[PDB]
Amino acid sequence: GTSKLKYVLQDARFFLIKSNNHENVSLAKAKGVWSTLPVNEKKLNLAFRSARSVILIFSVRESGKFQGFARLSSESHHGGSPIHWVLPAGMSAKMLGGVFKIDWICRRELPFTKSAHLTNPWNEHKPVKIGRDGQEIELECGTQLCLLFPPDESIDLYQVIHKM
Template identity: 45%
Template sequence: MQQWLTGSSGTRYFIIKSWNHENVEASQREGTWATQPHNVDTLVEAFKTCRNVILVFSVNKSMAFQGYARMESLPGTAPEPAWVKNLRWPSSPPFYIRWITIANTRFSRVGHLKNALNENLAVLVGRDGQEIEQNCGASLCELIDEERNQVF
């Protein structure tokens, strides 16, 4: 488990939704992401005030999380990912991320985790940009790490 995941008040967690696996796979190769414009202010504020901003990715209708990454720069600092050109809606300026764990983790493995920042609903319930309470976020990342470790 990553040392900084536990006990650090300098870490914030967010759900990032993607319309398809291809965009997430491209992000894993390129180390960049662009989000919906309404998420920018929250992510910028978190990046400027926290040591770690962790983005937990889930492809819509996949019934799983695909892994998590650390935000490495502010929006507007990375080249535009090729997949952004195919979007039918606006996106934020791109930013760098560093993938920490890539593992398809079924919602059934994490459904017991409740997010206090989203009416205490299961962590798997959340819109793009939904913040995850710190202990819940750390536990979610631990389960994703366990899933990856079971594959090997």
């Protein structure tokens, strides 16, 4: 069903994450972590304190798809075990902010062709697939986008609900 998912998404905030490669999304799915540049790190930390759920929706550049979505479970923190991200050319690990813990809600893919009817008011009402890394997605658009993903029957949202 979709009822616990809708509960998790109620009054949530949504952010588009545009990964340079599949390897970084694979690492995030395996380890339950994400790291971003300080400009986005600051936005996500502010959002984490402001809302019952902050949802990251992931898309690998040139894939034509989203790869899933996850909920922030912490603010960013430094000093963990290093994560061997595959960084964009011209970028060192020192340029990253801290590490966010995340709980995956859906690890299934959604092709952009299925989200063509959804536009993001916070990005000039362009299709929600369009946006820079860290673009906030307005509540209604973000909720409908998440509801379009195939259900991920491997995930039990009971655990996610208790952290809210």
